[PDB]
Design an enzyme around this catalytic site. Structure first.
Site, PDB file in Angstrom:
ATOM      1  CG  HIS A 151     -21.010  -1.797   5.745  1.00  0.00           C
ATOM      2  ND1 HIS A 151     -21.164  -1.831   4.375  1.00  0.00           N
ATOM      3  CD2 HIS A 151     -20.273  -0.693   6.014  1.00  0.00           C
ATOM      4  CE1 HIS A 151     -20.545  -0.800   3.831  1.00  0.00           C
ATOM      5  NE2 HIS A 151     -19.973  -0.100   4.816  1.00  0.00           N
TER       6      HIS A 151
ATOM      7  CG  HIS B 180     -18.837   6.530   7.860  1.00  0.00           C
ATOM      8  ND1 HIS B 180     -18.145   6.896   6.714  1.00  0.00           N
ATOM      9  CD2 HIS B 180     -17.965   5.841   8.623  1.00  0.00           C
ATOM     10  CE1 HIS B 180     -16.911   6.425   6.791  1.00  0.00           C
ATOM     11  NE2 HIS B 180     -16.790   5.736   7.916  1.00  0.00           N
TER      12      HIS B 180
ATOM     13  CG  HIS C 142     -16.527   2.593  11.992  1.00  0.00           C
ATOM     14  ND1 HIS C 142     -16.492   1.572  11.060  1.00  0.00           N
ATOM     15  CD2 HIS C 142     -16.183   3.720  11.341  1.00  0.00           C
ATOM     16  CE1 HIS C 142     -16.117   2.064   9.889  1.00  0.00           C
ATOM     17  NE2 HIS C 142     -15.862   3.374  10.052  1.00  0.00           N
TER      18      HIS C 142
ATOM     19  CD  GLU D  87     -13.316   1.158  12.061  1.00  0.00           C
ATOM     20  OE1 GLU D  87     -13.736   0.080  11.649  1.00  0.00           O
ATOM     21  OE2 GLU D  87     -13.024   2.126  11.308  1.00  0.00           O
TER      22      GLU D  87
ATOM     23  CG  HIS E  28     -14.160   7.120  10.336  1.00  0.00           C
ATOM     24  ND1 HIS E  28     -14.137   5.807   9.922  1.00  0.00           N
ATOM     25  CD2 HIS E  28     -13.389   7.191  11.447  1.00  0.00           C
ATOM     26  CE1 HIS E  28     -13.344   5.123  10.743  1.00  0.00           C
ATOM     27  NE2 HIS E  28     -12.885   5.943  11.688  1.00  0.00           N
TER      28      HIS E  28
ATOM     29  CB  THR F 166     -11.329   1.289   8.933  1.00  0.00           C
ATOM     30  OG1 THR F 166     -12.711   1.625   8.784  1.00  0.00           O
ATOM     31  CG2 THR F 166     -10.465   2.472   9.334  1.00  0.00           C
TER      32      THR F 166
HETATM   33  O1  LIG Z   1     -14.259   3.561   7.409  1.00  0.00           O
HETATM   34  B1  LIG Z   1     -13.707   3.728   6.051  1.00  0.00           B
HETATM   35  O2  LIG Z   1     -13.741   2.414   5.374  1.00  0.00           O
HETATM   36  O3  LIG Z   1     -12.326   4.048   6.136  1.00  0.00           O
HETATM   37  C1  LIG Z   1     -12.061   5.317   6.730  1.00  0.00           C
HETATM   38  C2  LIG Z   1     -12.507   6.445   5.833  1.00  0.00           C
HETATM   39  C3  LIG Z   1     -13.779   6.131   5.075  1.00  0.00           C
HETATM   40  C4  LIG Z   1     -14.314   7.105   4.228  1.00  0.00           C
HETATM   41  C5  LIG Z   1     -15.480   6.867   3.522  1.00  0.00           C
HETATM   42  C6  LIG Z   1     -16.122   5.641   3.646  1.00  0.00           C
HETATM   43  N1  LIG Z   1     -17.281   5.364   2.899  1.00  0.00           N
HETATM   44  C7  LIG Z   1     -17.400   4.699   1.723  1.00  0.00           C
HETATM   45  S1  LIG Z   1     -18.661   5.032   0.650  1.00  0.00           S
HETATM   46  N2  LIG Z   1     -16.416   3.840   1.440  1.00  0.00           N
HETATM   47  C8  LIG Z   1     -16.333   3.059   0.222  1.00  0.00           C
HETATM   48  C9  LIG Z   1     -15.449   3.741  -0.787  1.00  0.00           C
HETATM   49  C10 LIG Z   1     -15.030   3.065  -1.919  1.00  0.00           C
HETATM   50  C11 LIG Z   1     -14.222   3.692  -2.855  1.00  0.00           C
HETATM   51  C12 LIG Z   1     -13.831   5.002  -2.665  1.00  0.00           C
HETATM   52  C13 LIG Z   1     -14.242   5.683  -1.541  1.00  0.00           C
HETATM   53  C14 LIG Z   1     -15.045   5.059  -0.607  1.00  0.00           C
HETATM   54  C15 LIG Z   1     -15.591   4.670   4.489  1.00  0.00           C
HETATM   55  C16 LIG Z   1     -14.411   4.878   5.220  1.00  0.00           C
HETATM   56 ZN   LIG Z   2     -15.207   4.671   8.707  1.00  0.00          ZN
END
Ligand SMILES: [O][B]1([O])O[C][C]C2=[C][C]=C([N]C(=S)[N][C]C3=[C][C]=[C][C]=[C]3)[C]=C21
Ligand SMILES: [Zn+2]
Ligand SMILES: [O][B]1([O])O[C][C]C2=[C][C]=C([N]C(=S)[N][C]C3=[C][C]=[C][C]=[C]3)[C]=C21
Ligand SMILES: [Zn+2]
Lengths: 257, 257
Positions: free
Chosen positions: B61, B91, B93, B103, B116, B196
């Site tokens: 994704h 990363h 979005h 976002e 992010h 997110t």
């Molecule tokens: O945009 B987001 O979703 O939300 C915003 C912050 C953020 C940070 C990292 C990540 N990246 C991964 S690998 N997420 C999965 C994960 C699972 C369990 C524990 C930690 C992290 C994604 C995001």
């Molecule tokens: Zn993110």
């Protein structure tokens, strides 16, 4: 003016280019049970000088690798030809998906992409412009490209595409011998045909190789990631540029083999 | 599974991830008239050691740049934090067009993309696995990206995308300080929120930068030319991965400025 969308694509081309409904249109389905083996067909001879390689251009529907065609350093001979023909360009056609993308079909089988290596008759004409709309003016090698193993011979070509992402961009492209992209054997079908897009001139003697070459689904994704828009505009990736097959209308497809 | 399609996208996430309907979900719209200045907010301090940069990976994704997080060479503190937070990932979005890919929104204005930069609480916890589900576990800097001039600070990240074209592909990614991607001013908003995308844990203190950074249409196209499919399968480009803004449910968005 023309493209590959429903509004402007192959089924509407006849409105600006009436030859689109002509009797020597390309590409065709090669029905192998109806090919005439012709004994007088000699082997195909390519002798390309990598120095003739000049540049790579994004032309909005496709990308082109062009060659210096001022002299006979890079020529195609043999096959059905008495004349030497001068290398001027190679390019590719591809489709929306891996299941289609070739222009030519063999026994109704659709391949993933197609290489065209294009030559003009410098023994009879003094320019591409003079040759382009003569019946005997162009020689084009078609190679069917079968989705499979990544083709490392494509590598210089695909590495250059980052320099020409948007319509109008060009970069030098030198020291490249396109015979390195040809299959191992040059056994071939030949028929009198056309350019497969505008201006659709019925000027092409086709050499369709019976052997295919490989390309990975990710090399095909590189072609499709090329953009048809100008720099700054919203991205419109070049998803496809393959013309459907056209009626043989009584033409004979001869085999060398 | 989960994704961003009509099949597996943000509006049906609550089926597999019921916290999707929670009271501290992200992103949100930051309404500048409603933000509260908090005199306790210190300036944000980032110091990242470029030698913590480890690897870049296609996760289907998105793509992630991951950092070694075994010590505090790379830390976030100040702002609303008593604790030091250990850099672990950045990363992006983006959206299917350049008009709508962020976002967070500011006074309902959607930006083209969002960075992010993710950190975990190395004062109160000893790993990311542990911190990920704690209210005070994660600290994430969010920078809004406005389509315009090419951002040269993205160059090393964008150059690395060719080695990770398909899902599961990873490559070394070393000697990078992602504080170079931050805007000049680190004036921020902060609110309590979530991941997110799944697993959507309400573990995140957001630091949303007041200042946006630039990105070109062609740099966004490079994000969208990454493939969500595994090697060999038919190319599916990563066209979007942005979540819609969620109900604020009585939370206060504080301003540093
Ligand atoms: O945009 B987001 O979703 O939300 C915003 C912050 C953020 C940070 C990292 C990540 N990246 C991964 S690998 N997420 C999965 C994960 C699972 C369990 C524990 C930690 C992290 C994604 C995001
Ligand atoms: Zn993110
Ligand atoms: O796939 B195709 O259409 O048909 C097959 C052969 C071929 C060769 C070259 C090209 N490339 C160009 S720039 N075509 C335009 C042209 C060529 C000559 C004269 C005027 C105008 C295209 C093709
Ligand atoms: Zn062609």
């Amino acid at each position: 003016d023309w493209g590959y969308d429903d509004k402007n694509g192959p089924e509407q081309w006849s409105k600006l280019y009436p030859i689109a409904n002509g009797n020597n249109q390309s590409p065709v389905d090669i029905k192998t049970s109806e090919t005439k083996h012709d004994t007088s067909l000699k082997p195909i001879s390519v002798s390309y000088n990598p120095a003739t390689a000049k540049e790579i251009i994004n032309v909005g529907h496709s990308f082109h690798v062009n060659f210096e065609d001022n002299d006979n350093r890079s020529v195609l001979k043999g096959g059905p030809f008495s004349d030497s023909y001068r290398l001027f360009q190679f390019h590719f056609h591809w489709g929306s998906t891996n299941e289609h993308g070739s222009e030519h079909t063999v026994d109704g089988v659709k391949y993933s992409a197609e290489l065209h290596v294009a030559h003009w008759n410098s023994a009879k004409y003094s320019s591409l412009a003079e040759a382009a709309s003569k019946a005997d003016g162009l020689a084009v090698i078609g190679v069917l490209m079968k989705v499979g193993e990544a083709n490392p011979k494509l590598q210089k070509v695909l590495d250059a595409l980052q320099a020409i992402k948007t319509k109008g961009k060009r970069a030098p492209f030198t020291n490249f011998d396109p015979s390195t992209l040809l299959p191992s054997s040059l056994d071939f079908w030949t028929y009198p045909g056309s350019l497969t897009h505008p201006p659709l001139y019925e000027s092409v003697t086709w050499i369709i190789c019976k052997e295919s070459i490989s390309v990975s689904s990710e090399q095909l994704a590189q072609f499709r990631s090329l953009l048809s828009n100008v720099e700054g505009d919203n991205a419109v990736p070049m998803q496809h540029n393959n013309r459907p097959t056209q009626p043989l209308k009584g033409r004979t497809v001869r085999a060398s083999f």
